[PDB]
């Protein structure tokens, strides 16, 4: 399963990012860049211009009608509004699902990075402090024994090699903090956006239902209030279309080159080869951690051989401080367990799956949901324009 | 993230399973057992009895009305039907999402098991065939050299140890086939179920819309066909409630003890320690594969030591057919790569995540969707009962 850009992503990416004063920006995902933000603002301003044109057209139509089948038009408008609200519910659910998929992927990546850091730090601190303490305690036990201290200093050098090899592993403390911040911000924004769109759907349904009630019961003050709220809802729906279009364009622009964006943004705290390994994930047997993991496992194996040989030969001679030998053997066993867990976590599979899940959430689900919310906004605008244009005819009966 | 049974699961599991002849049957999940299937059939028969009682009540009410505000009742029935169809859409989407989550989890577990089997088989066949061929070819190269053949036979014994250790790993060929069959069946059943419920929603909405149309236009002939279709839709909705209730009870009974069910069903194909390891993720415990992976890595390290020492020493003397030594070194490098990939894949994390994702799909999403579909069925039955009971009054005006 390798990522491939969907069709709608590459259609939306083809949308000219033209900026404010009609100057073509390069249209490559780069938030913070003035030109890209200006292109998004230009899309928002285009949607606002469409809103202004629609309001002007509605005002002109009402002026012409009031200075110069309607039930069928009202029924058609209500049906179109109901279809729009259904499409909006579908799009809102899809966008929320995509955002939550991204949140889960980020949380899983954060958990894996924190686990890698925890094992690295624990193994290093253990093999330093506890091992040096045990060897120092054994130092006096093996009194006047040249070979039995040569083997202990060999153990010390091998532990130093272990610590040196582990220290060369990437530290994900910064990356965990960035992922936590991104996850919290995504959760906050997604919650507020879903709540706002749910309130918009509820308001739209209430307005349509009360307008139908006023049509049935021939209300006078009720209908005027519903038309005022209809103008307000048309304004709000065009603003929602602006937001949905800008967000969808930005999302498609990012999703065209997600690996490129991730490589560029993570040049600081993550090495290039590690990022390429976790993003493209070649099955060609080339892992940046392979050499250090092999060195660590060889060092652990060697120390186990020396400690086992010492235990086999120290019992006939001393048999006094063998509790320290068993403690060291247990420490090496736990270190090998930590080795297996680490070489499992530093593997591509989990992080590549998390990255692919995040991309699927924010492109296959989030972007489709944004498109459907834009379709909702356009359909609601059309329905409410039809409701307002057929306004005076029902008002004058 | 550890699995915990939700509240609604333990409420639904508390539902008595009393069989057909009112004999209490065990509530533990056992689809193959006859008594459990009889309890599910009893739940279906209870729902059918409720359907029959509702039909009898409707017939009695119509007989009383036809042998002896209505617009408000029709509007209330239409509103309740619309709410029911919305709840049914939500439940259908949720159930489909849960089933697809289960399908994805099963596919991921299948991919991991297939990869483990592929690495094991490839490494075994390589270390047998290619290594024996290279050593046999080197046999004549090191003619009349006892030490350089003792080292080669040592390499042969270490390769045999590698093959023996790898052969002790579980073979997932059977589990792969079972997972493929389960995923295919789940996909087929989910597709057909979603299509059937979508058709039911479409039919219900069409019937309600045409009934509302005939209410205003006073077309009695169409409303007789709509009454017949309403009786049929009430029957179908009660059948759907039967299916949803039985499936929800079965799902809750399974989900109370998913670990127990998985352990009991997978007793011969998979060793019990392996199942416990991948189900209760023993991060603080131990891995059943740790000993064999340690033996395999130690063997690879040893053989690399002998081959490196031989290459360092054989080139100055012979320098003939040393491409075989480089090929053996490349083979050992690829074998260490396969070792790292295997010890990554045989880890607990990936399979435990797949299992937890499957449980979340079929319990947090599938069961909730089934409950909402049952609520849809009950609400649609109530709405159509209200539509039929207010039948003769609108018919006779
Ligand atoms: C991401 O992982 C980090 C681990 O580094 C989590 O941070 C810890 O969170 C626990 C939970 O309250 C705190 O008790 C610790 O003090 C935190 N430690 C550090 C170093 O921050 C973090 O919560 C995780 N975030 C997510 C969203 O999973
Ligand atoms: C550290 O691990 C080793 C190997 O697992 C333990 O040595 C024994 O190894 C044999 C394998 O030939 C096992 O059958 C024994 O069960 C192991 N001993 C025990 C007590 O389990 C070694 O004992 C471990 N270290 C400690 C402190 O227990
Ligand atoms: C589960 O994994 C198995 C691998 O053992 C897949 O089976 C292979 O599928 C490919 C795809 O067409 C075939 O070309 C092979 O002949 C199959 N091999 C065997 C041994 O069956 C299977 O497709 C996977 N299933 C899912 C749902 O992912
Ligand atoms: C198998 O791997 C070893 C170790 O990676 C290769 O030996 C060289 O090891 C040093 C590390 O001290 C690397 O810097 C060299 O790049 C390695 N050599 C090469 C050619 O890359 C050994 O060469 C590998 N086997 C083969 C056939 O290339
Ligand atoms: C956009 O930027 C990329 C990278 O900086 C560059 O390769 C590309 O040529 C730019 N586009 C244009 C039209 O110059
Ligand atoms: C990242 O993108 C910016 C803007 O296109 C560019 O200036 C910079 O060189 C890029 N970084 C890398 C490492 O290519
Ligand atoms: C159901 O079976 C389990 C195990 O076979 C048993 O422990 C339990 O008591 C049984 N249920 C009843 C009600 O006896
Ligand atoms: C599996 O469940 C059946 C039915 O409850 C029981 O008879 C059997 O002993 C169980 N298997 C195991 C291994 O417990």
Author numbering:
A (entry chain B), B (entry chain A): 6 to 73, 88 to 416
What did the article's authors report about this structure?
To obtain a comprehensive overview of TTYH conformations, we have investigated the structural properties of all three paralogs in distinct environments: The structures of TTYH2 and 1 were determined in GDN under Ca2+-free conditions at 3.3 and 4.0 Å, respectively. Both proteins display a novel fold with very similar general features. For simplicity, we describe these common features based on the TTYH2 structure and emphasize differences to other paralogs wherever relevant. In TTYH2, the interactions between subunits are exclusively mediated by this extracellular component, which buries 1800 Å2 of the combined molecular surface in an extended dimer interface. Whereas in both structures of TTYH2 determined in detergent and in lipid nanodiscs, the two transmembrane domains (TMDs) are separated by about 7 Å and thus not in direct contact, they have approached each other in the TTYH1 and 3 structures by mutual rigid body rotations of subunits by 6–7° around an axis located at the extracellular dimer interface. Additionally, there are contacts between the TMDs of TTYH1 and 3 but not of TTYH2. In cryo-EM maps of the three paralogs obtained in detergent, the pocket is filled with residual density reflecting its occupancy by small molecules. In TTYH2, six elongated density fragments line the entire pocket perpendicular to its long dimension. As all proteins were purified in the detergent GDN, we cannot exclude that the observed density would reflect the interaction with its cholesterol-derived diosgenin moiety or breakdown products thereof. To investigate the apolar content of molecules that are co-purified with TTYH2, we have prepared methanol and chloroform extracts of a purified sample and analyzed its composition by liquid chromatography and mass spectrometry (LC-MS).
The Tweety homologs (TTYHs) are members of a conserved family of eukaryotic membrane proteins that are abundant in the brain. The three human paralogs were assigned to function as anion channels that are either activated by Ca2+ or cell swelling. All TTYH molecules are dimers and contain an extended extracellular domain, five membrane spanning segments, and an unstructured cytoplasmic region. In light of its distinct protein architecture and the absence of functional evidence for ion transport, we thus conclude that the TTYH family does not form ion channels and instead confers other catalytic properties.
